[PDB]
């Protein structure tokens, strides 16, 4: 259970750039935290990660390139990608995202392999 899966070590922090903001509003709280979820519906793009902040707005979304790496780590729950917005979404346009990446030694090989192979983080 949670003693296995929630128990994860820090990989570090990853830098991203959310294109999905300008979809509807591109507004959040000045220091939000965004949760990365996989496809909420998207049939042919199951890779497409639907990002939603802890306020409850589905404001963020990855591109098929960015999501194309993290999709394996997301769907199979190989590691945790926890997003945070210190920028506050001052503009509706694309801003730097700060994702603090967690995961376990066992999965680190497969995860890091995909991260350097595809070369995409968000």
What whole-number distance in Å separates Cα of residue 9 and Cα of residue 3? Answer: 13
Strand partners, 103: 9, 79
CB atoms within 10 A of CB 112: 14
> Are 34 and 53 in contact, with CB atoms under 8 Å apart?
yes
Q: What is the DSSP letter of 47?
A: T
Sheet containing strand 50-53, strands side by side: 9-18, 95-103, 79-85, 32-37, 50-53, 60-61
Rounded to whole angstroms, the Cα distance separating 13 from 16 reads 10
Angle at which helices 105-118 and 64-75 cross, to 10°: 160
Residues 6+ apart with CB under 8 A from 79: 8, 11, 73, 101, 102, 103, 104, 107, 108, 111
CB 115 within 8 Å of CB 12: no
| Residues sharing a CB contact under 8 Å with residue 34, sequence separation 6 or more, in sequence order | 28, 51, 52, 53, 54, 59, 60, 83, 84, 85, 97
Q: What are phi and psi of 90, to 5 degrees?
A: -65, -35
**Residue 23 DSSP label:** G
CB contact set of 108 (below 8 Å; sequence gap of 6+): 11, 79
What is each CA distance from 97 to 13, 54, 63, 122, in whole angstroms?
10, 15, 14, 7
């Amino acid at each position: 259970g949670s003693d296995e899966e929630v128990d994860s070590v820090l990989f570090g922090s990853l830098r991203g750039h959310v294109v999905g903001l300008r979809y509807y509003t591109g507004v959040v709280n000045n220091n939000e935290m965004v949760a990365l979820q996989r496809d909420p519906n998207n049939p042919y793009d199951k890779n497409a990660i639907k990002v939603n902040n802890v306020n409850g707005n589905q404001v963020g979304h990855l591109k098929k390139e960015l999501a194309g790496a993290l999709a394996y780590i997301m769907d199979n729950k190989l590691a945790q990608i926890e997003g945070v917005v210190p920028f506050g979404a001052n503009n509706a346009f694309t801003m730097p995202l700060h994702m603090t990446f967690w995961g376990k030694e066992e999965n680190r090989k497969a995860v890091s392999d995909q991260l350097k192979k595809h070369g995409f983080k968000l």
